[PDB]
Design a binder for this molecule. Structure first.
Ligand SMILES: O=P(O)(O)OC[C@H](O)[C@H]1O[C@@H](OP(=O)(O)O)[C@@H](O)[C@@H](O)[C@@H]1O
Ligand SMILES: [Mg+2]
Ligand code: NA
Ligand SMILES: [Zn+2]
Length: 183
């Protein structure tokens, strides 16, 4: 039963520019790739869990997302970061694109993507971590019983509510390996 770092994408791995869906607009946050490779060496499985309502909004297609995500996966793999899972949610109750127009339980703060990852990779949840920049991330983590909930300051400016719900607040994902290592 392996421990994991569940990872928000926009604002945590890549600078949030708003509905990022193009390679030219994807900017890794400083030091996160190195930090992810270290996390891995410390024996954590790494699992991306990202809301992509942009798809239900019509801003871009599930297939452009697929294209970006494949590129992202390779860029990481080529840097010795091998992601154990990539989960996403294309939905929004008010979506303008029918096939993604719906309520769901994968859309954080619903824990859908975390539990699914739990089942499919057999993750020790109480020994796992959630890293994101929003309240919905802390709430999603809480529901799924993720032991350690980590807010970061690299994305959405943090709300006091997001901070209420988090266990740690770090400047960045780049800081996580250190934070963990000192217990
Ligand atoms: O789950 P992660 O953060 O990786 O992806 C989701 C994003 O943060 C997106 O949230 C969106 O709105 P929401 O869906 O909250 O109504 C937007 O603010 C996008 O520009 C933003 O990047
Ligand atoms: Mg985010
Ligand atoms: Na949105
Ligand atoms: Zn969903």
């Amino acid at each position: 039963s392996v421990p994991a770092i569940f990872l928000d994408r926009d604002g945590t791995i890549n600078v949030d520019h708003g509905y990022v869906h193009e390679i030219d607009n994807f900017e890794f946050i400083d030091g996160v790739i190195d930090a992810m490779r270290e996390l891995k060496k410390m024996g954590f499985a790494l699992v991306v869990v990202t809301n992509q309502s942009g798809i239900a909004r019509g801003k871009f297609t599930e297939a452009q997302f697929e294209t970006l995500t494949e590129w992202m996966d390779w860029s990481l793999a080529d840097r010795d970061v091998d992601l154990d899972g990539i989960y996403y949610c294309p939905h929004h109750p008010q979506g303008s694109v029918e096939e993604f127009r719906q309520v769901c339980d994968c859309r954080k703060p619903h824990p859908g993507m975390l539990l699914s990852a739990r089942d499919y990779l057999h993750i020790d949840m109480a020994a796992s971590y959630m890293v994101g920049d929003k309240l919905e991330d802390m709430q999603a983590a809480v529901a799924a019983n993720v032991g350690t909930k980590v807010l970061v300051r690299t994305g959405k400016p943090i709300t006091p509510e997001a901070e209420n719900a988090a266990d740690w607040v770090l400047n960045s994902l780049a800081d996580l390996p250190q934070a963990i290592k000192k217990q």
